[PDB]
């Protein structure tokens, strides 16, 4: 029966990150026993065109959160060289609240990331790979360095990588506490010893990137699944999930759940099934659920009426006036102050703005002040529409998407819990005469 209509209930043998919980040896020997570094020399000898074709057939979309088609994005580096070196940059900043998958990939399956770096660099002709990891992940970075040393000694990377005759280097670069440095151009600035301020596009990194050289920035999960995709083929990955939503996904479920956890599941699994299956359900029962933030703090929240039938993919969540994001599910029950949580998120965005452009730099602080007043109820009902207009002005007028990630939660809160705001304002007006 082709054209599956129900998604989820993934089997263990179909999973990619078979050591997500660190229950097996993360070193080279354990990874090799688990299928890593298996005839990767043959994968490299197939040529960049074959790898790009496999990635395109796989239907993989960017796991950083934007869902850009990975094959089309990687094909931009398939140009002949113009004298400059070519680089691959692996995004390990992992800044969203609610997101924990890349940390586990780095700490427990580092050789998977290293092999993916090698495969992707060969596919895009990159000379070396720079892995930019946040400085808070010190032990994770040291584990990654140990894995890279093990790969270097085994001849898997370096000169004559895996005997394929292709030279490749893997470098680990640590940032210092900056959520904006996860954005690709801001990350490139952070690597080059400058402030973590995003660059205007165009030019795109494929034209002008790190050190002014052609560059591709890819998420850790996107890089770490490429060797398995090439080993099993594009078709195997493609079968899972809906059309244009292919493959497997890592889900982080936190907040008001009985068993907050990071789990691997098929793409188009319904949110209710995922929560009641792996997270142990909502604290106090499913009927106690108030709202869910499906894709990290940048995506708008959805109320209970939407979570019982929505699918955890890009298109389904877009239809639900939200986004798949990083697949970071944050669950809030009916005991939660919904305004206070969004105010805390807006405070996070106010503290994480790099301040380069006017709309983010001032408007995000303005919305932070307005929502701080909203939490107490000191404002007036017309200020709700005022804040909606302020958010609209910030959105689409900024250099990078941090403004989008600050505006969207406010829009979702105003869309779905306006009566709560009005009721709090009315209570404040009563109490303060």
């Amino acid at each position: 029966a082709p054209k599956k209509t129900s998604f989820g209930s993934l089997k263990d043998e179909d999973r990619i990150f078979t050591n997500l919980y660190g229950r097996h040896d993360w070193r080279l020997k354990g990874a090799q026993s688990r299928g890593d570094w298996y005839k990767t020399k043959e994968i490299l000898l197939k040529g960049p065109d074959w790898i790009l074709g496999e990635v395109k057939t796989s239907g993989l979309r960017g796991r950083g959160g934007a869902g850009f088609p990975t094959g089309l994005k990687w094909s931009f580096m398939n140009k002949p060289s113009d004298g400059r070196p070519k680089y691959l940059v692996v995004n390990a900043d992992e800044g969203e609240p609610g997101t924990c998958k890349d940390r586990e990939i780095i700490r427990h399956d580092p050789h998977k990331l290293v092999e993916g770096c090698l495969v992707g660099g060969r596919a895009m002709g990159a000379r070396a790979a720079y892995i930019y990891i946040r400085g808070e992940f010190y032990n994770e970075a040291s584990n990654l360095q140990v894995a890279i040393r093990e790969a270097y000694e085994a001849g898997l990377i370096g000169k004559n990588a895996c005997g394929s005759g292709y030279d490749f280097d893997v470098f680990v670069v640590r940032g210092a506490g900056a959520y904006i440095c996860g954005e690709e151009t801001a990350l490139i600035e952070s690597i080059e010893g400058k402030q973590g301020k995003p660059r205007l596009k165009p030019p795109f990194p494929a034209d002008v990137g790190v050190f002014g050289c052609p560059t591709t920035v890819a998420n850790v999960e996107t890089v770490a699944v490429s060797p398995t995709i090439c080993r099993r083929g594009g078709a195997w990955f493609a079968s899972f999930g809906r059309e244009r939503n292919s493959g497997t996904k890592l889900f982080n479920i936190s907040g008001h759940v009985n068993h907050p956890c990071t789990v691997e599941e098929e793409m188009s699994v319904p949110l209710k099934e995922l929560i009641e299956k792996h997270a142990g359900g909502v604290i106090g029962g499913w009927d106690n659920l108030l709202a869910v933030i499906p894709g990290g703090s940048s995506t708008p929240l959805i109320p209970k009426s939407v979570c019982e039938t929505v699918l955890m993919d890009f298109d389904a969540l877009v239809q639900a006036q939200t986004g798949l994001g990083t697949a970071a599910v944050i669950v809030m029950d009916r005991s939660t102050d919904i305004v206070k949580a969004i105010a805390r998120l807006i405070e996070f965005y106010k503290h994480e703005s790099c301040g380069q452009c006017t709309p983010c730099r001032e408007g995000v602080d303005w919305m932070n002040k307005v929502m701080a007043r909203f939490v107490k109820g000191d404002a007036r009902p017309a200020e709700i529409d005022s804040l909606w207009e302020i958010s609209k002005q910030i959105e689409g007028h900024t250099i990078c998407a941090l403004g989008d990630g600050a505006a969207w939660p406010v829009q979702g809160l105003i869309r779905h819990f306006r009566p709560e705001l009005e009721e709090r304002m009315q209570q404040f007006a009563l109490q303060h005469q």
């Binding site: 043998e13 026993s33 994968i43 609240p97 956890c261 944050i330």
Partner: protein
């Protein structure tokens, strides 16, 4: 909240350009290794690693150390000032021996990070911006240290302590001030981000190499 720290440097006897700072020979070897990781003509890419190494050697970053990094990398000192004042992991004032960082972002907030903050407050008798009189502990608030699943969590000197109850964090503080080394990780009997319910996934033994490989490879 408004950031308490300022972004203008005024010379003090404790912190001024004549403050003695220099890199140890081992640190200079490490700096050489760091610098050889970038292409020639782009030495400025090493500003962040060398500045972090200076902080790790000294504990914090006096302006003399920042000037030294600028001189070593042949970078104007203002660029190093920009880097040091942009990134929050850099300490431009002295901190305690154990820098306690408690995540209070919404995912951790929902799991009662306020209880952890208050327990630390009443165990140390200081606020979220103060240092203990013995200069052992410094407590601050941070944003999303990347362990939302294991909320509530706390970082102390690049070590993670998660799945915290007030008594657990107080015990960690006791054994920290006793000179012991507390084991980083969750305190609820779960090793990592796995569900506490009994490992709902990844139960079968992992498949051997080449198990799912296609033909023609």
């Amino acid at each position: 909240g408004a950031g308490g720290a300022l972004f203008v440097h005024r010379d003090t006897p404790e912190n001024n350009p004549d403050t003695p700072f220099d890199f140890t020979p081992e640190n200079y070897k490490r700096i050489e290794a760091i610098v050889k990781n970038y292409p020639e003509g782009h030495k400025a890419a090493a500003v962040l690693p060398v500045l972090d190494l200076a902080q790790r050697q000294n504990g914090w970053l006096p302006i003399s150390a920042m000037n030294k990094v600028a001189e070593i990398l042949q970078v104007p000192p203002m660029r190093v000032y920009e880097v040091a004042t942009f990134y929050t992991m850099y300490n431009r004032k002295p901190v305690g021996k154990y820098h306690i960082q408690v995540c209070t972002t919404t995912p951790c907030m929902l799991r009662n990070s306020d209880s952890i903050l208050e327990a630390i407050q009443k165990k140390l008798g200081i606020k979220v911006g103060e240092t203990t009189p013995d200069k052992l502990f410094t407590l601050i608030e941070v944003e999303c240290l990347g362990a939302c699943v294991n909320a509530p969590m706390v970082q102390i000197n690049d070590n993670y302590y998660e799945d915290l109850t007030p008594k657990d964090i107080e015990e960690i503080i006791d054994e920290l001030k006793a000179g012991k080394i507390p084991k980083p990780g969750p305190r609820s009997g779960r090793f990592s981000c796995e569900p506490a319910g009994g490992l709902t996934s990844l139960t079968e033994p992992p498949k051997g190499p080449g198990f799912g490989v296609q033909a023609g490879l």
